[model samples]
Target: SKAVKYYTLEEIQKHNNSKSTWLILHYKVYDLTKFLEEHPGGEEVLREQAGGDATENFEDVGHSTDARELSKTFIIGELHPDDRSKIT
Candidate 1:
């Protein structure tokens, strides 16, 4: 009965290594290690939550003129099972 399941970056990497479940996230996520210094808002807030659940704080950033461009740096590391129904 959980609305959301959270995973650390390391945990996600572990799950991905096993090839059992895809490392998926419902919201936009950032890589603290790579994006930390270049963060538009600041680095501390993201560094504080590195390797942990950061979806909520990511939402608080208001807006990003380069969000789409920024997201391109991340891999689309998830494939929802339900999404298969849309393939046809």
Candidate 2:
């Protein structure tokens, strides 16, 4: 099994390029670099959200249960308590 990793919000912003599309969804970090072009929703949709929190946008889109389930597959780990705690 792969070892778990943790990423803070600031670090998530550092990966906001074509090289790595790190995203924050519901306080969990996700690496979507591989899905940039493969995303069925279109590359721009994902591209626009690279290196940022996408929870609001995702919920606004009313993503399907399947989409939520699949999203977990790309998770890197939770946002650190120092940062995510403020989200509460």
Candidate 3:
């Protein structure tokens, strides 16, 4: 039952609120609500980038390997093949 779930950028945009709050990071999708209050930085930081790719900010902010490791636990799927290249 470990099928790969694929999501489009358009699909990801729907979950822009605290109720769902999913985002793209490192080519994968995370439903930030899982640990919404567990973020050390602050929840608004994640909410501000809600429903979009946060990959650039994480690297620019210099997140560690451990931070990346923590993110994997929340991953729901990959960006859809058709929409993968359009990331900016």
lDDT of 1 by residue, 1-88 (tens): 5344333444444432112322222432333355556767776665455443444555566646576467557533433344423223
* Candidate number with greatest TM-score: 3
> What is the per-residue lDDT of model 3 for residues 1-88, given as tens digits with 9 covering 90 to 100?
7999999999999999999999998789999896789998889899999999998988898888898899888999999988878887
Where does model 2 exceed 4 Å of error? 1-4, 85-88
Report the number of the highest-lDDT candidate: 3
Clash count, predicted structure 3: 0
> Which pairs of residues collide in model 2?
none
Residue-level lDDT tens digits of model 2 in 1-88: 6776677778888888878888888889988888777676888888788878888888998889988888877888878778887553
Put the candidates in lDDT order, highest first: 3, 2, 1
- Residue 10 lDDT, candidate 1, scale 0-100: 49
How many clashes would you count in candidate 1?
0
Local accuracy by lDDT, each model? 0.45, 0.82, 0.90
